Design a protein around this nucleic acid. Structure first.
Ligand code: MG
Ligand code: MG
Ligand code: MG
Ligand code: MG
Ligand code: MG
Ligand code: MG
Ligand code: MG
Ligand code: MG
Ligand code: MG
Ligand code: MG
Ligand code: MG
Ligand code: MG
Ligand code: MG
Ligand code: MG
Ligand code: MG
Ligand code: MG
Ligand code: MG
Ligand code: MG
Ligand code: MG
Ligand code: MG
Ligand code: MG
Ligand code: MG
Ligand code: MG
Ligand code: MG
Ligand code: MG
Ligand code: MG
Ligand code: MG
Ligand code: MG
Ligand code: MG
Ligand code: MG
Ligand code: ZN
Lengths: 131, 100, 224, 127, 211, 100, 83, 115
RNA sequence: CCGGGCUCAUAACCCGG
RNA sequence: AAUGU
RNA sequence: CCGCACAAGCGGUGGAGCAUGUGGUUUAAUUCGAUGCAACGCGAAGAACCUUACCUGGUCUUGACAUCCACGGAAGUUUUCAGAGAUGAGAAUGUGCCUUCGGGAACCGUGAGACAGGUGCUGCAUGGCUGUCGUCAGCUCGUGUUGUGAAAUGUUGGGUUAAGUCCCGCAACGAGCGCAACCCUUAUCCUUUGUUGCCAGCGGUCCGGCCGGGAACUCAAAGGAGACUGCCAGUGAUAAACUGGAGGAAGGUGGGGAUGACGUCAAGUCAUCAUGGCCCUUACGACCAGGGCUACACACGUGCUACAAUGGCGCAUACAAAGAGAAGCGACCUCGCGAGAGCAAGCGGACCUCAUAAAGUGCGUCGUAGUCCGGAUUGGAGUCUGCAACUCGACUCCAUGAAGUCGGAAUCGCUAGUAAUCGUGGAUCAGAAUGCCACGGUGAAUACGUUCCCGG
């Protein structure tokens, strides 16, 4: 907003685990408020990744996220009065958000037959850091 | 709405009132499932004979006051153009702006 | 009042030398260190005669008014006035107080009215917020009108702590031809004064001497 | 004794008649799992007991009505929280600090003149 | 900016509904029409009366009507003579027994409608409108000790180009719900075209709502 | 036992409160057992019309009518009670219905 | 279309005119306006001048058109191409 | 399998592979599969020839394919010979059952061309 | 070339065939 | 981007 | 300095088809009106006939609509012939009512005029009503002022707000209209009234609050309590204000609504209505039938359904809110693949009906494809209203299966219970909702910040 600063909105932690990160992932992934289906898909891809690679669903998920977290950005800001593409640091929250958004974009573009499949394969790629 | 319009309407309504029973009865005849084909045929033939305006449909629910043939309310018998005024005179009993 | 009193009272002090203020080279004892020195020997006659006039004024039932905006004498002016039940302005001279007394009367009315309601206490009938507002407003009015509310009309003369700090009041009063008794210090102009006390205008002791002599005179003349 | 509380979320109402018991859950005289098609609402509603870790010791005789699955779940939770502290005051401090106690007030907007929706407007014609 | 009717805003609590009889949807439209017919007839009858207002009532399957005017005598008639001339036809259009009641306006200057009707009459009688507004507001401020606003609009002075003008005195918090405004308007015929009028009279910051 | 039942309709809740007051007291004095008038949910009809003549098409404003309800029932009412209820006549804005 | 229970429609004056014509063997074209009239078999081999808002269009009844309207064969509007 | 002429139903669930027959919508397909007492789901494969043949008989009862279209053409030609409103618009490639001709008529008129 | 964009226009420039 | 009520 | 004015988000338009409005063209006629923003799913909350103002033909001339005079007849009812109809021609028929007993009132016909009639002109002659700046924080007056005057001052400066909100300094002093507030709706608790509404605890039950009982609970509608920066801190010129904390259902305008300060656009409306003034009187008035308002090489606006596995198809099975009903809404039961048909209970409606919400969720299936995708077009045949569906209605079954696989230049909207997504109602209305207004269910991301925009 122009005039003065604002905060941000809090949301539920997932009852199944309690990973707010997962809460944000399901949210960013959800469409048309269809949260039930979204969480179903998330859990399916989560398990079919962790149980085919790594030890614990949550831990595999986390390390995968890590493996793609960025640190710098370039989106221009008119700091000098013009649209300079100055590279500035990225907020850790923003880092996570971008990581999640990107990985979900990849799963969307991965294929047609199983959303759960596409997702798990994407995150397997992420954990392996070749994706 | 020109006076001729209203004359037409009043004549129409009066006449429609005149033939109501006759037409309803012949309708009952015609629709009847088991009714003789010939009787149905004759009834249908006759129904043409009645005045065209007699049919209730040809009316129009004009505003009572202005007679404007649009924006009519049955709840009030008037065009939208008038009910706002009458409402805000507070004359329309218990009529008040809705803020819920 | 002895001249020695004026010297002790620091009446002789002077303002820092001012460019293009050559209006009053005369009437000054001297100057040094950017301090112009006042001719108190002139003060003694001027002072005593101003008192001589004021005695008659008070014997006239003369309504004096005392105006003070040099903060150092704000108390003193009120005290001398109340010593003779005379009216005063310790507060700022909000301007117009004379030239649109026509206007000011209304404010006087409203002050009276809020006083009356306070004595009714019917503020409590209103929301507490409004009542505290009402009290605030009444105080705000009393802050300035208290020293003049009682006169019911224009005074008979002005007493000025300092021809300068009280400038606007003098300006206003001159339009009516009201006499002005004023202290004029170096770098201050009698041009607007009727009766002048040559003396330092920014020393409390000088204020005290002026006001004591003045109040004694006004009290006696009023009391005949 | 009898302990009671009322709950309301969205546009739903819930009666919580609750008594020292064994934690059985009866919702409209139905099993919780039979009530909500997914554990989700079950997980959500069980939380207030979860804080107290006293999940085992009441008998729950319950109604919820109106709204939808989710609002209803929320009403169930609200009523349960109230009825519980209504049962025992001393738990109230931890309960509120634990963020259970408030009542949600958000509700819907009406449709408005010139709007298709609460906060959506027809196409503008670009100029 | 165009305004909302003062009466309508004040109608819910401060201003009475000139009619308040009950009806189902069934009778409602014709009940309204009967009220309209009667009142128009009354206005012609009451024009000499210049009655401020008329309420129509439907107690117990029978109608009733009350009229407020500047002069009780004008509207009534000696020994109640004329009132019955009206009662006949009003009971007739009403199709039901009818009765007339008259409430005197005790300070006609304080009625928006009366002020407006007077102003309009003088206008049609070629009295200078500005003088009319002057004296009217003068009376109002003298008598009510409370604000008044007034306006006029049209081919003022028979000019070839139209215009409007208005005048205010004292307080007129139209926006405040608590403030009560006697609002009305009127018509002033002109040898050329039309002239309109509108009035707002603040009388006292109500305490106690409709009660 | 004989049961008398009473419903009331009008546009003002206060008016109906007072009417009921009259209805109950008149039945109390006469000594019939009286059921306290039962409040009931009210209907509200809503409407809106274009408030502007000719082309401008926005700005329709809305209005609402609220009709309040109250109910009273009398059991084993005294005959004097019954006629006493009959005797009462309600304000023009009030609409009354009684049933046995 | 018209319910079968309801039976066919024809406009009585027209029916009388056609019955009379066939009986007489006059066989001259019949002015009319009753587009809504339905075509019947008895009127086969006949000719009818159907009004079209401006003019009565000649038409030669034949068995094929039986069961049609009379207005179906009498176009009202016109169109000859924008270009 | 070759059925109802020279048509080959693909080897999908019998009912839909049967709908593949032109002139056979889902209704007729369900009907035929019922009549044969044949589970609709079955592939076209795994059917003894006799089941195929009884299906051939079944479809025999239809009006289908070449004769279907032949009839359609006869109806439309019949319509076109009339000179009526419907026939004229039929021959003009214009909406025939009363849709606006000002706009939204492509599927009948065709892709836009310049004026 | 025509037709669409750009303006409060008409140009400039812009898009599509 | 030149000229324009 | 400010706000969907950018930035960060989400998702559309622009292409496909159709719906709808408009430009042009065309026609006997396609009735009239609205125009950057602020016309163009707009007047119109609903054109088959009527509507209807236009076209074509047929008709009338004190007249379709009102009074006034004379004159003749109760009224009215039933019925035939011509005519597309308007009308024309006849038949019997009524034959009455109050009558002071004179007649009169009733009505009806004819005749005489005076007049009637206009959707004919002017929104730049007008009133009324409406759009627009803009729910933008401003706008002015009295006295005084000082300045010779023309004036300005007030209303500027120092802090602070959503704000001319407030504090402070201050030739100005004080006032009014805007702001805020007084109002509805909404959130927690109480009193009070308990059926048609309620069932915790009683007793019985075929288990059906079914009924005995019960006034707890929920709930209904009236009336009360409830938030004040009030509290702690801190900070600030001690000011005002600002930051945090507790308490609490609700914390700092708790949310939403109404409410639109002076005035701008000779903005719009002579077609709701009003009217200056002006044009027409066998016609610019009126009646009748059919035709048009929906045409159709093209351009434009707004929209609906899409191009599919988050999906398609089948079987089973959860949870809402609000409205409308007497020529009405209409159950149960029977008939039909279906639209529907027949019989007929209840409810003016906490009682009866409309009327079983859909998204969700268990099981199964479909494997990326012009598809079990999409659905238009076209054929055939049916139901309903209505006198009457040819031009031109909606709705049902079989069969037919376009384009279309995310869409350039360019561009719209949104900050939470919002966007998005999914169902319900009502009004105009015989019949005709992809428009318009309400109602629930499910239900998010983004915000560095003020530098380029845009209007203030
Ligand atoms: Mg109709
Ligand atoms: Mg049990
Ligand atoms: Mg139920
Ligand atoms: Mg719109
Ligand atoms: Mg919705
Ligand atoms: Mg408004
Ligand atoms: Mg098919
Ligand atoms: Mg942006
Ligand atoms: Mg125009
Ligand atoms: Mg005939
Ligand atoms: Mg005659
Ligand atoms: Mg204008
Ligand atoms: Mg103009
Ligand atoms: Mg100024
Ligand atoms: Mg603001
Ligand atoms: Mg109780
Ligand atoms: Mg400090
Ligand atoms: Mg403090
Ligand atoms: Mg706290
Ligand atoms: Mg507050
Ligand atoms: Mg306000
Ligand atoms: Mg016609
Ligand atoms: Mg049109
Ligand atoms: Mg399909
Ligand atoms: Mg219906
Ligand atoms: Mg294709
Ligand atoms: Mg057909
Ligand atoms: Mg959709
Ligand atoms: Mg709908
Ligand atoms: Mg309806
Ligand atoms: Zn000094």
């Amino acid at each position: 907003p122009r005039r003065r600063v604002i905060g941000q909105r809090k949301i539920l932690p997932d009852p199944k685990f309690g990973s707010e990160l997962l809460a944000k992932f399901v949210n960013i992934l959800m469409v048309d408020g269809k949260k039930s289906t979204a969480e179903s898909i998330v859990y399916s891809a989560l398990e079919t990744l962790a149980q085919r690679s790594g030890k614990s669903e949550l831990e595999a998920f986390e390390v995968a996220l890590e493996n793609v977290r960025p640190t710098v950005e370039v989106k221009s800001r008119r700091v000098g009065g013009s649209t300079y593409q100055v590279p500035v640091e990225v907020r850790p929250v923003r880092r996570n958000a971008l990581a999640m958004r990107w990985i979900v974009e990849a799963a969307r573009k991965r294929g047609d037959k199983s959303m759960a499949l596409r997702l798990a394969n994407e995150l397997s790629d992420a954990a392996e850091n070749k994706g | 709405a020109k006076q001729s319009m209203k004359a037409r309407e009043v004549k129409r309504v009066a006449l429609a009132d005149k033939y109501f029973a006759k037409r309803a009865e012949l309708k009952a005849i015609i629709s009847d499932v088991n009714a003789s084909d010939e009787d149905r045929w004759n009834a249908v033939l006759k129904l043409q004979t009645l005045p065209r305006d007699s049919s209730p449909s040809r009316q129009r629910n004009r505003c009572r006051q202005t007679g404007r043939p649009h924006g009519f309310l049955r709840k009030f018998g008037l065009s939208r153009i008038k009910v706002r005024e009458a409402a805000m005179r507070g004359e329309i009993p218990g009529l008040k702006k809705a803020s819920w | 009042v002895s001249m020695r009193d004026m010297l002790k009272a620091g009446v002789h002090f002077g303002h820092q030398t001012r460019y293009w203020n050559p209006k009053m080279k005369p009437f000054i004892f001297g100057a040094r260190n950017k301090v112009h020195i006042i001719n108190l020997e002139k003060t003694v006659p001027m002072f005593n005669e101003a008192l001589a006039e004021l005695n008659k004024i008070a014997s006239r039932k003369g309504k004096i008014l005392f105006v003070g905006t040099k903060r150092a004498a704000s108390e003193a002016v009120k005290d001398a006035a109340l010593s003779c039940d005379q009216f005063f302005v310790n507060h700022r001279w909000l301007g117009g107080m004379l030239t649109n007394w026509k206007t000011v009367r209304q404010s006087i009315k409203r002050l009276k009215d809020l006083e009356t309601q306070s004595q009714d206490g019917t503020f409590d009938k209103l929301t507490k917020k409004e009542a505290l507002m009402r009290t605030r407003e009444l105080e705000k009015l009393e802050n300035s009108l208290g020293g003049i509310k009682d006169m019911g009309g224009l005074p008979d003369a002005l007493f000025v702590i300092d021809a300068d700090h009280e400038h606007i009041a003098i300006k206003e009063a001159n339009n009516l031809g009201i006499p002005v008794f004023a202290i004029v210090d170096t770098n201050s102009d009698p041009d607007g004064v009727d009766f002048v006390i040559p003396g330092n205008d920014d020393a409390i002791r000088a204020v005290t001497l002026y006001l004591g002599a003045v109040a004694a005179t006004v009290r006696e003349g009023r009391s005949q | 004794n009898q302990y009671y509380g009322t709950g309301r979320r969205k546009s739903s109402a819930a009666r919580v008649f609750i008594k020292p018991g064994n934690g059985k859950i009866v919702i409209n005289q139905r099993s919780l799992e039979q009530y909500f098609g997914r554990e989700t609402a079950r997980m959500v509603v069980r939380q207030p007991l979860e804080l107290v870790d006293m999940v085992e010791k009441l008998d729950l005789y319950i109604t919820v009505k109106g709204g939808g699955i989710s609002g209803q779940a929320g009403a169930i939770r609200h009523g349960i929280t109230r009825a519980l502290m209504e049962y025992d005051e001393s738990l109230r401090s931890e309960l509120r600090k634990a963020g259970f106690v408030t009542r949600d007030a958000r509700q819907v907007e009406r449709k408005k003149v010139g709007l298709r929706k609460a906060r959506r407007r027809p196409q503008f014609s670009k100029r | 900016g165009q305004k909302v009717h003062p009466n309508g805003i004040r109608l819910g609590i401060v201003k009475p509904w000139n009619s308040t009889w009950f009806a189902n949807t069934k009778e409602f439209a014709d009940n309204l029409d009967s009220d309209f017919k009667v009142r128009q007839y009354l206005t012609k009858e009451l024009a000499k009366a210049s009655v401020s207002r008329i309420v129509i009532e439907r107690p117990a399957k029978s109608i009733r009507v009350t009229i407020h005017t500047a002069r009780p005598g004008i509207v009534i008639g000696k020994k109640g003579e004329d009132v019955e001339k009206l009662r006949k036809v009003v009971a007739d259009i009403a199709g039901v027994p009818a009765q007339i009641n008259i409430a005197e306006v005790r300070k006609p200057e304080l009625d928006a409608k009366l002020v407006a009707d007077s102003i309009t009459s003088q206008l049609e009688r070629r009295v200078m409108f500005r003088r009319a507004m002057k004296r009217a507001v003068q009376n109002a401020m003298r008598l009510g000790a409370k604000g008044i606003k007034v306006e006029v609009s049209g081919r003022l002075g028979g000019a070839e180009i139209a215009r409007t003008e208005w005048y205010r005195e004292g307080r007129v918090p139209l926006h405040t719900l608590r403030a009560d405004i006697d609002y009305n308007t009127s018509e002033a015929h002109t040898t050329y075209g039309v002239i309109g009028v509108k009035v707002w009279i603040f009388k006292g910051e109500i305490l106690g709502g409709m009660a | 036992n004989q049961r008398i039942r009473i419903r009331l309709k009008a546009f003002d809740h206060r008016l109906i409160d007072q009417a009921t007051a009259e209805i109950v007291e008149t039945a109390k004095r006469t000594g019939a057992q009286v059921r306290g008038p039962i409040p009931l949910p009210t209907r509200k009809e809503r409407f809106t019309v274009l408030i502007s003549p000719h082309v401008n098409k926005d700005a329709r404003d809305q209005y609402e009518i609220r009709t309040h309800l109250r109910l009273v029932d009398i059991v084993e009412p005294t005959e004097k009670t019954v006629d006493a209820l009959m005797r009462l006549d309600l304000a023009a804005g009030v609409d009354v219905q009684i049933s046995l | 279309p018209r319910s079968l229970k309801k039976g066919p429609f024809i406009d009585l004056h027209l029916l009388k005119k056609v019955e009379k014509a066939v009986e007489s063997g006059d066989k001259k074209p019949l002015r009319t306006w009753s587009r809504r009239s339905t075509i019947f078999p008895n009127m086969i081999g006949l000719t009818i001048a159907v009004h079209n808002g401006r003019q009565h269009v000649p038409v030669f009844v034949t068995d094929e058109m039986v069961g049609h309207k009379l207005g179906e064969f009498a176009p009202t509007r016109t169109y000859r191409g924008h270009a | 399998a070759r059925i109802a002429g020279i048509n080959i139903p693909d080897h999908k669930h019998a009912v839909i592979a049967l709908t593949s027959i032109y002139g056979v919508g889902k209704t007729r397909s369900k009907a035929i599969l019922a009549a044969a007492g044949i589970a609709e789901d079955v592939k076209i494969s795994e059917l003894s020839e006799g089941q195929i043949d009884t299906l051939r008989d079944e479809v025999a009862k239809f009006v289908v394919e070449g004769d279907l279209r032949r009839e359609i053409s006869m109806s439309i030609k019949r319509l076109m010979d009339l000179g009526c409103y419907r026939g004229l618009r039929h021959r003009r490639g214009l909406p025939v059952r009363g849709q606006r001709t000002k706009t939204n008529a492509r599927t009948r008129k065709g892709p836009r061309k310049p004026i």
